[PDB]
Design a binder for this molecule. Structure first.
Ligand SMILES: [Mg+2]
Ligand SMILES: [Mg+2]
Ligand SMILES: [Mg+2]
Ligand SMILES: [Mg+2]
Ligand SMILES: [Mg+2]
Ligand SMILES: [Mg+2]
Ligand SMILES: [Mg+2]
Ligand SMILES: [Mg+2]
Ligand SMILES: [Mg+2]
Ligand SMILES: [Mg+2]
Ligand SMILES: [Mg+2]
Ligand SMILES: [Mg+2]
Ligand SMILES: [Mg+2]
Ligand SMILES: [Mg+2]
Ligand SMILES: [Mg+2]
Lengths: 119, 88, 101, 73
RNA sequence: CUUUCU
RNA sequence: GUGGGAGAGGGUGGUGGAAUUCCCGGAGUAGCGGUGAAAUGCGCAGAUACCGGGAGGAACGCCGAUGGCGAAGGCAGCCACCUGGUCCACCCGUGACGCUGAGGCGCGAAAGCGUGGGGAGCAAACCGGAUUAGAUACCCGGGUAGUCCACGCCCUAAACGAUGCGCGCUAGGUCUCUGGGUCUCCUGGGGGCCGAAGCUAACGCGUUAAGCGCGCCGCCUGGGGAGUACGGCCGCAAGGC
């Protein structure tokens, strides 16, 4: 219920789960999806496949709001980032562009031990 | 900082004879100058240690020159001091 | 007495009247701090690399004054005061180090 | 592997010290507000050292970016 | 994954 | 002395953008998260993912080096101010004014202590989840001191080149940072590698000596007991010498 066509897609990947989010030209979300969304709990969640599924899911749903053209924006890494894009590109939506806008500090907060080590 | 003028004006003020740059007095003169400036810089910046060492060194080189003076011509010495303001 | 360079950037929306208002103050300000103005280079409006104060543009200025080192800060401490003034950067005069020449 | 050409060549008698010369500086930044290496700018540790200093000034002034979005991928 | 001892 | 040079050397004030956290508005829905798997935990009082605005703390990507500066500890966004060291050229001045250095005085990473402040992220202790035969651990979710600032202590360290300081002498080759030059090479200061002679138990060192020599200081004298006991001195204490 809105009809957008020209939209925008956000792919937030991680070594833990992928999760796409379609949005309108202003940036307001319309439909979103995760590996979680579609079954898959815990481990299976991340995997490139789940990412494909979620990718599609995201489109398929926004296919209702009448989406067509989308600008893809990738954030993060993880098995499934590049993969998801593959999906969107197919899906049905026209993937006018792709841009990596993964956040990166210019050295601010001390990461947790998990990711420490740098000297 | 210390103007070339500020500096040279002091050199002239002390030279043993026309064109005296390295005489013992001249030197002691200059040091008391650089010392006094920095002596001040730290009046404020009591944290700026690194600079303070530079200071310790100056005080050194000075006492050393003077000691030599005191030794060689005990006269000029007594002169330079008073003429400056060393030994409070 | 040292030669500097006063980069200044204010709101690009100002109207010739409001704009002059600010300049009026800037000139004064400089003179209020012994900022003898060697020269000016008023570039105007320009596309900023990133937005500033929300505006995607910026109206620049550039004065190569000469003034008392002991008061450079005071001067800008004074310039930043103005609200339409969003950026101030008092560099110091530097001999143009060339390259590939 | 930085095997294209030294930015310096495709340039002229320029003042590495000028921090408002966007048109020329913009050359030493990658496809992001990232100041290129010497294996790409091709300047002396000294020249390169100065550029870097300059660019950063442009950033504050707002003439040069700090980091751009990477297109393609 | 932890994954001892002679 | 004069004229130059480079630099994250130190101190003060200011200031820039990135990211994290929190708060506000929007849009949007069923999860997010985390792991080897999981769970704890957070989410329909609507979390996560997305946009906009705000507040705040701490750190400063690229440049960045195999780099520079400092006596060491140590020092990297940018700006100005204050300030130390140091190298080169000119041979211009003084005329052995030199070296070392028991005590003394000062400086001295981290943790730690006192008073006040600050607190975003991180995180001893601690509280839970998991793993295990057991888990007072490793992994996961929280989290206080602390980490940050000021002022006053503390005085330690693989405080490492595990190599005290200064000076003279003893093949070169090569890379590099910074100055000067008659600037495809010369020359001075500094950082590296290979290597003459020589040295070394060996490994290695080798004009940045661990070579050849002289000056001064510190230090060693088999292992454990023990950096303990005792005495002394210092400290608020921990504790140090
Ligand atoms: Mg046994
Ligand atoms: Mg002579
Ligand atoms: Mg004579
Ligand atoms: Mg200490
Ligand atoms: Mg501490
Ligand atoms: Mg405390
Ligand atoms: Mg536990
Ligand atoms: Mg923990
Ligand atoms: Mg935590
Ligand atoms: Mg060599
Ligand atoms: Mg050398
Ligand atoms: Mg041999
Ligand atoms: Mg060797
Ligand atoms: Mg014994
Ligand atoms: Mg006591």
């Amino acid at each position: 219920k809105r009809q957008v066509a020209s939209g925008r897609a956000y792919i937030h990947a991680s070594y833990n789960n992928t999760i796409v989010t379609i949005t309108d030209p202003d940036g307001n979300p319309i439909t979103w999806s995760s590996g979680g969304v579609i079954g898959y709990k815990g481990s299976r969640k991340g995997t490139p496949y789940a990412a494909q599924l979620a990718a599609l899911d995201a489109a398929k749903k926004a296919m209702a709001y009448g989406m067509q053209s989308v600008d893809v924006i990738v954030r993060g890494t993880g098995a499934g980032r590049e993969q998801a894009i593959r999906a969107l590109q197919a899906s049905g939506l026209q993937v006018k562009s792709i841009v990596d806008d993964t956040p990166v500090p210019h050295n601010g907060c001390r990461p947790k031990k998990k990711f420490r080590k740098a000297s | 900082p210390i103007t070339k003028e500020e500096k040279q004006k002091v050199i002239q003020e002390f030279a043993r004879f026309p064109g005296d740059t390295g005489s013992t007095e001249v030197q002691v003169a200059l040091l008391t100058l650089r010392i006094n400036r920095l002596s001040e810089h730290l009046k404020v910046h009591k944290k700026d240690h690194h600079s303070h060492r530079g200071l310790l060194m100056m005080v050194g080189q000075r006492r050393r020159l003077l000691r030599y003076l005191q030794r060689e011509d005990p006269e000029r010495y007594r002169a330079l001091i008073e003429k400056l303001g060393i030994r409070g | 007495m040292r030669r500097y360079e006063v980069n200044i950037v204010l709101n690009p929306n100002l109207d010739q009247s409001q704009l002059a208002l600010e300049k009026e103050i800037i000139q004064r300000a400089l003179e209020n701090y012994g900022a003898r103005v060697e020269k000016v280079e008023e570039l105007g409006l320009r596309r900023l690399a990133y937005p500033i104060a929300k505006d995607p543009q910026g109206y620049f200025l550039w004065y190569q004054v000469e003034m008392p080192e002991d008061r450079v800060n005071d001067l800008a401490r004074e310039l930043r005061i103005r609200d339409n003034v969003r950026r101030v950067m008092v560099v110091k005069s530097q001999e143009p180090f060339l390259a590939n020449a | 592997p930085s095997r294209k050409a030294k930015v310096k060549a495709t340039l002229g008698e320029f003042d590495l010290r000028d921090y408002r010369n966007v048109e020329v500086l913009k050359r030493f930044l990658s496809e992001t507000g990232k100041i290129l290496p010497r294996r790409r700018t091709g300047l002396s540790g000294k020249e390169q050292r100065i550029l870097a200093k300059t660019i950063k000034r442009a950033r504050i002034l707002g003439l040069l970016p700090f980091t751009e979005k990477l297109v393609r991928k």
